[PDB]
Design a protein around this ligand. Structure first.
Ligand SMILES: CCCCCCCCCCCCCCCCCC(=O)OC[C@H](COP(=O)([O-])OCC(O)COP(=O)([O-])OC[C@@H](COC(=O)CCCCCCCCCCCCCCCCC)OC(=O)CCCCCCCCCCCCCCCCC)OC(=O)CCCCCCCCCCCCCCCCC
Ligand SMILES: CCCCCCCCCCCCCCCCCC(=O)OC[C@H](COP(=O)(O)OCCN)OC(=O)CCCCCCCCCCCCCCCCC
Ligand SMILES: CCCCCCCCCCCCCCCCCC(=O)OC[C@H](COP(=O)(O)OCCN)OC(=O)CCCCCCCCCCCCCCCCC
Ligand SMILES: CCCCCCCCCCCCCCCCCC(=O)OC[C@H](COP(=O)(O)OCCN)OC(=O)CCCCCCCCCCCCCCCCC
Ligand code: HEC
Ligand code: HEM
Ligand code: HEM
Lengths: 60, 241, 80, 68, 380
């Protein structure tokens, strides 16, 4: 039974072009997940102080 | 006296490393500036459109801009005319030129408060200590008209009358407008006015710390891979004797 | 003119190496990194540290001497 | 029903501490010395500065918890 | 077939200077710093170019253009504070590069050392005029003080200062020509750095043991490629934590006021990397004496290869000269602290003693110590 890095090498990491493809796909998915997580951390640090937390009080 | 008094450190809500500004306090401090500080001080590098998305909405800032009158021209006859203000307009001048400020303020020039916590040592702590630090002068020293004692001002003789007392304005959100609360709000507003990029800068810094915490051990591991091919190399000297 | 092939004359020297995929990148990182760092800092601390120690003393003395230089002398305003 | 400034209440609560009352004692010794002399150029701004430094240090330790 | 890397006339130079270059295997992290300097140069140039698309070199509009960059250009505050803190990072890496060259005996590469001290003079001039460029209170008064003390040269000094000013004082022509010169000098710095690399590549690099490393050399790629990449990443970490978290810890607050010729500041400083020289400049109560003290305080690095009296190149096996070197670093830090202090007691006597000790350690104490160290090993 092969392990996870062994199957990752056999399917993706062997060819350099597939290495580039999984790097690009992981780059876009990591970009989306990292911006979501880092943003959620940032409003969790500063709750009730940013404009998007007090925005509902003044809009009509 | 040439001796100076350093302002203390106050526990600001933006004092922390990733701590942003309290935007309700910036809104209240803008109200404090509009009703009190705008009579003498100028804000040449701040416009009304900077308030959109920070303290006010688009229509609230549009109403705030259209409350005042802006000189504009030239007309088709070549003459100047007053017009209602808009979002692209900057904050109105109290005086057309600094010599009018000198004439109206007994020879003193009220400085432009767009970088006033960036151009002073102490920052908003200095502004809070100056606004809440007006007191009677001690014995031995005497001061004339147009002068007021302030131990945080260098030279301890400021030409600015104390502008903030208890209930100098009425807030929109019903907050009690004491001297300390009004001074804290206007210090927060002046901190935003000097650094409008502050929350974005700290969010960028948080993302930078997370990315460097991800990337430094991985690049270190790649370096130690490509160098641990060499760091376990063994040598042997075999002379033929 | 100066490349690999004509750098030095070396005789009777054997080198052994292994693949980086064959060996660990962090072989006993802490357990041998800590005594090596301790050995290096104990071989260099007496040469490095005492100049910066006396910089700290000179800095503190100069700051406090300036502070008492701005201090009011109580000997003045004593005759009258 | 006057609106009470919390800064004032914190200010005398901080003047009840010991370094502030010692510096205030030196300030009264100075104004006793200076105000009882006819012609002098002595000004004691420096221990007024010491008293204000200690007092506003302990004020800034605990002022902002009472401000909305 | 044909190996394209070793035959193509553009790729051959790139190969010989970055891939198949024989480098010593044992050079520490200090040897990263020069490459960092090159990266910093590129970073400065790139950020400088993106400051130049919105900056106006007019005394009515220079401060307004800088505030417009910080407030209205998208991420313009980021590029401006990256430029300022990258100048500070440039001088940090420059000082550590020069300290590496002094400690490990790398000044025996004399042509490389002289091209280096020329690069150091050019970088200091570029940073001075760049700090004049935002036209704040501090910029105008620093330029006024530096040119006024440059007027100390007899019989030509007033004419030279009025020629540099283009007028009776620091005015619009001074700011515009300082913009032109600050724009053009980093490309001359890049060309001088290419000459610097050529003069190093005639003989290879030095190693921390100071011995002939010809028996143990490795290709530059991939070892020092990935080591320089790691150093670039660490330097970028320090630069972005300087920009995004403490953007004004190294600058002066008084530069955020507009330039008032009528109002003088209570205390006038250059930025921190000039400060020690400023202390030396005020350690002599004579204007020409202070000016020549500053010039020889920078040029003593050029005088350094003629003062080497030891039979060992590096200081790895030389403990007395190591102690003297760290005392030299110590009073360089002391002169940096004095340069930011006002001229009263005891800063005057501390700065005078620090300047005397600096020149006596570099000129007198190190060759005598090297003679003593050669005597201890039964060599002299
Ligand atoms: C201490 C606790 C850990 C420990 O024992 O570590 C042992 C380890 C030393 O182990 P060793 O086996 O004795 O030495 C071999 C090295 O590990 C071999 O590695 P190295 O140290 O030669 O690596 C090259 C050098 C490369 O360093 C650079 O390139 C630095 C560039 C200059 C600094 C940045 C420029 C700006 C400076 C402004 C001032 O990197 C370092 O010195 C450390 C890099 C750390 C990256 C982030 C890790 C998280 O300590 C370190 O590596 C120190 C740093 C990490 C802690
Ligand atoms: C040439 C060298 C230039 C400087 C290199 C480091 C620059 C770091 C930086 O300022 O990153 C800013 C960026 C903030 O990202 P942000 O604007 O929030 O948007 C993400 C998607 N919405 O932050 C990021 O993207 C994450 C931080 C990356 C830091 C560099 C890592 C290598
Ligand atoms: C800071 C810590 C410095 C330090 O650790 O110094 C000791 C270290 C010892 O290294 P070494 O003597 O080569 O021996 C290796 C071990 N046997 O020695 C070194 O790491 C040598 C460091 C050389 C470069 C130091 C630069 C310091 C800053 C100098 C600024 C001013 C330069 C001159 C300007 C004019
Ligand atoms: C006599 C040495 C006795 C040592 C006893 C310790 C135990 C030794 C045996 C056990 C081994 C322990 C670890 C050994 C580490 C390496 C060896 C070592 O530290 O050797 C001692 C070292 C070198 O000795 P050496 O150079 O021969 O002494 C000449 C002194 N000038 O010498 C030193 O480290 C001494 C350094 C003293 C530096 C004093 C500097 C004072 C002046 C600083 C001025 C700075 C600027 C001031 C301001 C100027 C402007 C106003
Ligand atoms: C007209 C009576 C003014 C009112 C209303 C406000 N300020 Fe003012 N200010 C005024 C003058 C004439 C001066 C200069 C006095 C001098 O001797 O220089 C000032 C100065 C300031 C400063 C600068 C302090 C410094 O160290 O330079 C600040 C930070 C300041 N004033 C703040 C301030 C605020 C926040 C105000 C609204 C509550 C305000 N001032 C109103 C004149 C007048
Ligand atoms: C050719 C490339 C360069 C260009 C086009 C350039 C351009 C500029 C411009 C337009 C400014 C004014 C904007 C501002 O206030 O920041 C500036 C400021 C500055 N530059 Fe450069 N620059 C270049 C390279 C450098 C280098 C290599 C250094 C370092 C020696 C440097 C140091 C500075 C400094 C210290 C400032 C002042 C920053 C401040 O306001 O605090 N510049 N530069
Ligand atoms: C403009 C800034 C500078 C740049 C970009 C620069 C660039 C470089 C580079 C890329 C190297 C090779 C890598 C290394 O050994 O670190 C190097 C080495 C060297 N530089 Fe510089 N340098 C600069 C300033 C200086 C100065 C001011 C000096 C003189 C004090 C100097 C003297 C040397 C020496 C002696 C070496 C050889 C290192 C050795 O073999 O020990 N450099 N420089």
């Amino acid at each position: 039974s092969p392990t996870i890095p062994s199957r990752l090498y056999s399917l993706l990491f062997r060819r350099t072009s597939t290495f580039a493809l999984t790097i690009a796909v992981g780059a876009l998915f990591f970009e989306r997940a990292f911006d979501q997580g880092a943003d959620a951390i940032y409003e969790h640090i500063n709750e009730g102080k940013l404009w998007k937390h007090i925005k509902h009080k003044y809009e009509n | 006296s040439d001796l100076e008094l350093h302002p203390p450190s106050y526990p600001w809500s933006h004092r922390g490393l990733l701590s942003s500004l309290d935007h309700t306090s910036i809104r209240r401090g803008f109200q404090v500036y509009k009703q009190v500080c705008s009579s003498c001080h100028s804000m040449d590098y701040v416009a009304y459109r900077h308030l959109v998305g920070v303290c006010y909405t688009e229509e609230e800032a549009k109403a705030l801009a259209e409350e005042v009158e802006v000189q504009d021209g030239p007309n088709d006859d070549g003459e100047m005319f007053m017009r209602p203000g808009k979002l692209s307009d900057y904050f109105p001048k109290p005086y057309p030129n600094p010599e009018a400020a000198r004439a109206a303020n007994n020879g003193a020039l009220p400085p432009d408060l767009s970088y006033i916590v960036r151009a002073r040592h102490g920052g908003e702590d200095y502004v809070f200590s100056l606004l809440t630090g007006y007191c009677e002068p001690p014995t031995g020293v005497s001061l004339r008209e147009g002068l007021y004692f302030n131990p945080y001002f260098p030279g301890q003789a400021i030409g600015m009358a104390p502008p903030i007392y208890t209930e100098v304005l009425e807030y929109d959100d019903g907050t009690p407008a004491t001297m300390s609360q009004v001074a804290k709000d206007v210090a927060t507003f002046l901190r935003w006015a000097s650094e409008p990029e502050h929350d974005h800068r700290k969010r960028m810094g948080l993302k930078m710390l997370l990315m460097m915490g991800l990337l430094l051990p991985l690049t270190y591991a790649m370096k130690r891979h490509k160098w641990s091919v060499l760091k376990s190399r063994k040598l042997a000297y075999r002379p033929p004797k | 003119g100066r490349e690999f092939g004509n750098l030095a004359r070396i005789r009777h020297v054997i080198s052994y190496s292994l693949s980086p995929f064959e060996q660990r990148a962090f072989p006993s990182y802490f357990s041998k990194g800590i005594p090596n760092v301790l050995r290096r800092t104990r071989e260099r601390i007496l040469r490095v540290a005492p100049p910066f120690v006396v910089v700290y003393l000179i800095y503190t003395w100069g700051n406090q001497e300036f502070e008492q230089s701005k201090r009011k002398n109580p000997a003045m305003y004593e005759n009258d | 029903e006057e609106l009470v400034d919390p800064l004032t209440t914190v200010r005398e609560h901080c003047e009840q501490l010991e370094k502030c009352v010692k510096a205030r004692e030196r300030l009264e010794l100075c104004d006793n010395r200076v105000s009882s002399r006819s012609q002098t150029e002595e000004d004691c701004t420096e221990e007024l500065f010491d008293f204000l430094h200690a007092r506003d240090h302990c004020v800034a330790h605990k002022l902002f918890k009472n401000l909305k | 077939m044909t190996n394209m890397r070793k035959t193509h006339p553009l790729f051959k130079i790139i190969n010989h200077s970055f891939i198949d270059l024989p480098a010593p295997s044992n050079i520490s992290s200090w040897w990263n710093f020069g490459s960092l300097l090159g990266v910093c140069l590129m970073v400065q140039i790139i950020t400088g170019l993106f400051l130049a698309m919105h900056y106006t070199s007019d005394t009515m509009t220079a401060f307004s253009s800088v505030t417009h960059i910080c407030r209205d250009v998208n991420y313009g505050w980021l590029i401006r504070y990256m430029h300022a803190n990258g100048a500070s990072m440039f001088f940090i890496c420059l000082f550590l590069h020069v300290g590496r060259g002094l400690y490990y005996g790398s000044y025996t590469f004399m042509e490389t050392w002289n091209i280096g001290v020329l690069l150091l003079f050019a970088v200091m001039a570029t940073a001075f005029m760049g700090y004049v460029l935002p036209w704040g209170q501090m910029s105008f008064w620093g330029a006024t003080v530096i040119t006024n003390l440059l007027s100390a040269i007899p019989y030509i000094g007033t004419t030279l200062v009025e020629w540099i000013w283009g007028g009776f004082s620091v005015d619009k022509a001074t700011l515009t020509r300082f913009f032109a010169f600050h724009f053009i000098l980093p490309f001359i710095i890049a060309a001088l750095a290419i000459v610097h690399l050529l003069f190093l590549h005639e003989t290879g690099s030095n190693n921390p043991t100071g011995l002939n490393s010809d028996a143990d050399k490795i290709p530059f790629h991939p070892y020092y490629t990935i080591k320089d990449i790691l150093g670039i990443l660490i330097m970028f970490l320090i630069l972005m934590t300087l920009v995004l978290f403490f953007p004004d810890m190294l600058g002066d607050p008084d530069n955020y006021m507009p330039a008032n010729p009528l109002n003088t500041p209570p205390h006038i400083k250059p930025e921190w990397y000039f400060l020690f020289a400023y202390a030396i400049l005020r350690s002599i109560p004579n204007k020409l004496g202070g000016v020549l003290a500053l010039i020889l305080s920078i040029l003593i690095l050029a005088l350094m290869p003629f003062l080497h009296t030891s039979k060992q190149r590096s200081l790895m096996f030389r403990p007395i000269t190591q102690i003297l070197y760290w005392i030299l670093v110590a009073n360089l830090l002391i002169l940096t602290w004095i340069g930011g202090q006002p001229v009263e007691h005891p800063f005057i006597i501390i700065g005078q003693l620090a300047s005397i000790s600096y020149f006596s350690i570099i000129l007198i104490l190190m060759p005598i110590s090297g003679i003593i160290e050669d005597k201890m090993l039964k060599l002299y």
